[PDB]
């Protein structure tokens, strides 16, 4: 499955230049919005947008290009066509078979922050790691009922390696007898993963 | 800007002076690949991805050429308005739960990078360390600065204090995020 790219148009006749083509998918490929952006020193100065249907100058700098690119049929049709030839094509082919199908199970490990003393305050940390995609539910329990008080999760941590991490802390007081359970739901999981820690 | 998914199917970046270019695909925040401009090959982040999908590196090389051109054109057209340095920001966190004696990965996420020229190096107890060091490509941000992640394989000891050392033009002196 071969990926296609957006094609930068040629500007008309420390510095940083950036070109990109973005494909905004909603409900799979039922709705696709396609935007092309040209950026000079962090200022977008021209763009294509499948909603407008042509290049529009975003600033004074973009005037020359927008008007020219729009005036060459070979060019305009080439950029417009990318909504299908880049976005739809990449989504239905390469994407559907890679990122769109990636399913990494979370690792769940409970952990005790300070050396355990019964009848003393301490804090459990439920590390939920190495998972994909991002949608995930993590809940604590003490003897079977949900905890909401003294509970705190980090935001979703993006690892940069196509996996995610979330840490869920629970402030608690371990009594002799009680069982703490960390409960996680993720789409790569046939049934929820529970891990227990007995006081 | 609402959407379920967003692929950035071609990001081209070019800097002058120094002839620095970068070309990548991203999807929902993650790098599908960069094209090595010297080797001229497409390098997938996940190997198993490169087994299912492909990309002609030329597709990226040409884009770079265009973008190298446009940059020149836009440099004159602006009358040589140069880029403004930003101060980047770093955060260190381990990839897995830290257990002493077990090999892990420390991760340095540096953000608000602009321009995208940065030195990210690891220190352990103040001495340079480079164990299995991996660096990501510059990821794009909504405001057109970049972020980037470095990696370090290490064994967690209580006799060790790690720093992530970050060098940038927007920083009067190097900043180190302790951990």
């Amino acid at each position, epitope marked *: 499955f*071969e990926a*296609q*790219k957006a*094609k*930068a*148009n*040629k500007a008309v006749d420390h510095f940083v230049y950036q070109f990109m083509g973005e494909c905004y998918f909603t409900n799979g490929t039922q709705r696709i919005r396609y935007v092309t952006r040209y950026i000079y020193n962090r200022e977008e100065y021209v763009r294509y947008d499948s909603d407008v249907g042509e290049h529009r100058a975003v600033t004074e700098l973009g005037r020359p290009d927008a008007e020219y690119w729009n005036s060459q049929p*070979e060019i305009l049709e*080439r950029t417009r*066509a990318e909504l299908d*030839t880049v976005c739809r094509h990449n989504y239905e082919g390469p994407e559907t078979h890679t990122s769109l199908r990636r399913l990494e199970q979370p690792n769940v490990v409970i952990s005790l922050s300070r050396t355990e003393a019964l009848n003393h305050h301490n804090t459990l940390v439920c590390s939920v790691t190495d998972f994909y995609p991002a949608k995930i539910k993590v809940r604590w329990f003490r003897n079977g009922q949900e905890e909401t008080v003294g509970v705190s999760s980090t935001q979703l941590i993006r690892n940069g390696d196509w996996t995610f991490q979330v840490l869920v802390m629970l402030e608690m007081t371990p009594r002799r007898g009680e069982v703490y359970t960390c409960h996680v739901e993720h789409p790569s999981l046939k049934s929820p993963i529970t891990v227990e820690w007995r006081a | 800007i609402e959407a379920d998914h967003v692929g950035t199917y071609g990001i081209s970046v070019y800097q002058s002076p120094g002839d620095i270019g970068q070309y990548t695909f991203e999807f929902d925040g993650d790098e599908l690949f960069y094209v090595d401009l010297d080797k*001229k090959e497409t390098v997938w982040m996940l190997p198993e991805f490169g087994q299912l999908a492909s990309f*002609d590196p*030329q*597709g990226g*090389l*040409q884009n*770079i*050429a*265009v973008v*190298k*051109h446009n940059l020149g054109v836009l440099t004159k057209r602006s009358n040589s308005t140069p880029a403004t340095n930003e101060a980047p920001q770093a955060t260190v966190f381990p990839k897995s739960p830290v257990l002493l004696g077990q090999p892990n990965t420390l991760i340095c996420f540096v953000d608000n990078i602009f321009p995208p020229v940065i030195n990210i190096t690891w220190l352990r107890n103040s001495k340079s360390v480079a164990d299995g060091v991996y660096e990501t490509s510059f990821f794009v941000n909504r405001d057109y600065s970049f972020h980037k992640l470095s990696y370090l394989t290490f064994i967690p000891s209580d006799d060790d204090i790690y720093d992530c050392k970050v060098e940038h033009w927007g920083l009067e002196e190097p900043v180190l995020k302790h951990w």
Partner: T-cell receptor
Amino acid sequence: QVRQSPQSLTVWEGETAILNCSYENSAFDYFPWYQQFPGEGPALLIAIRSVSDKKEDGRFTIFFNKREKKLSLHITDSQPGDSATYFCAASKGADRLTFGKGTQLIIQP
Amino acid sequence: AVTQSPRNKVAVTGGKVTLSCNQTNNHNNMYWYRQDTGHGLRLIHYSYGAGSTEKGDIPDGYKASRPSQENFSLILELATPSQTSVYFCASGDFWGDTLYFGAGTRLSVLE
């Protein structure tokens, strides 16, 4: 790989010359034909995009079949001045072309 | 326009042969082809702009140089009989629907 048939083809003047082309890579989306007269370099004659199954331009038309990845240039009411070599090429997302080996066209008066 | 020089050449085996090509079309891309019966047009090297080049399908035995937006040169470092051919230079725009060829260069490498 782009494959043309035949190597050479003689046709009575006024008849419709048919030059065949065929390709292997399904991703190809752009198919231009080049016309080369003796002593000269080749020159774009007529071209088609896989989005379309036909392109007409006077006496020249291209018939395109995406399923069979087969492709055909028709020259109608052919003239001695149509004598030449005709190349079939292909492209993927606007990258460099790959040419077929070409077909020699000899029109008989 | 695309003009190749020289238009005819006789070289000896082991000699050096540079075929240059100037292009007046303000085009960014230039390509170097060869043509031999039973092989049609075969890309040898091309280039997206000054200072850089890219291997075609049959780069072996040929060097290439783009010192200019105007000029693209093909270098035969050690000329061999196998390189006996008619050579065509071409130019186009970025992503161009349309290649523009020069007139041709007949080269004979003789033993």
